[PDB]
């Protein structure tokens, strides 16, 4: 009865405590990688008004796309799925309020 | 350095694919426990209606529910902040070609 929905909640706890520490990762790489990229643009931008280099810096960018799309797709999904556990969060404090009566 | 500056981009990228599924998953998990202990709240309520350690324990629930909400607030905002950040350096480098 009181033991066990006292273990759920700790492995809740515990679930918060590893999405805590996959956020900061992800922010931390995020955060470094768009700098980089935004560096790697000023470069690209430099190096297309000089020596344009035919395929060497087209394909190059072309690369750095089909990477950022990638990410595109990742954050999408990863806006998709925070959205719905927001919403089902609210849900879930509506449900729980209206338990007690 | 180019190669150097894009192959860091690439290592960078392998671990950000990496924390997103690590992340998607707890997020998934979490919110099937939750749903799973609100139905288990739901069961024993309805054998003891005035139990005031089962209401103790919906009490806590609810403001770890309240200071999630507010943290799944905060990732939201984040995520979309990066996302137009790379929305911008998408159509940046869409532009030089």
Same mark, same amino acid.
């Given at each position: 009865?009181?033991?066990?929905?006292?273990?759920?909640?700790?492995?809740?706890?515990?679930?918060?405590? +590893?999405? =805590?520490?996959?956020?900061?990762? &992800? *922010?931390?790489?995020? @955060?470094? #990688?768009? %700098?980089? $990229?935004? !560096? /790697?643009?000023?470069?690209?931008?430099?190096?297309? +008004?000089? =020596?344009?280099?035919?395929?060497? &810096? *087209?394909?190059?960018? @072309?690369? #750095?796309? %089909?990477? $950022?799309? !990638? /990410?595109?797709?990742?954050?999408?999904?990863?806006?998709?799925?925070?959205?719905?556990?927001?919403?089902?969060?609210?849900?879930?404090?509506?449900?729980?309020?209206?338990?007690?009566?």
């Amino acid at each position: 009865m009181y033991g066990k929905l006292n273990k759920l909640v700790e492995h809740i706890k515990e679930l918060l405590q +590893q999405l =805590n520490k996959n956020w900061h990762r &992800l *922010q931390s790489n995020l @955060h470094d #990688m768009l %700098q980089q $990229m935004e !560096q /790697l643009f000023q470069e690209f931008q430099h190096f297309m +008004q000089g =020596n344009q280099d035919d395929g060497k &810096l *087209q394909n190059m960018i @072309h690369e #750095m796309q %089909q990477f $950022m799309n !990638q /990410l595109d797709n990742h954050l999408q999904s990863l806006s998709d799925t925070v959205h719905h556990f927001h919403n089902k969060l609210q849900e879930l404090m509506n449900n729980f309020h209206h338990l007690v009566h």
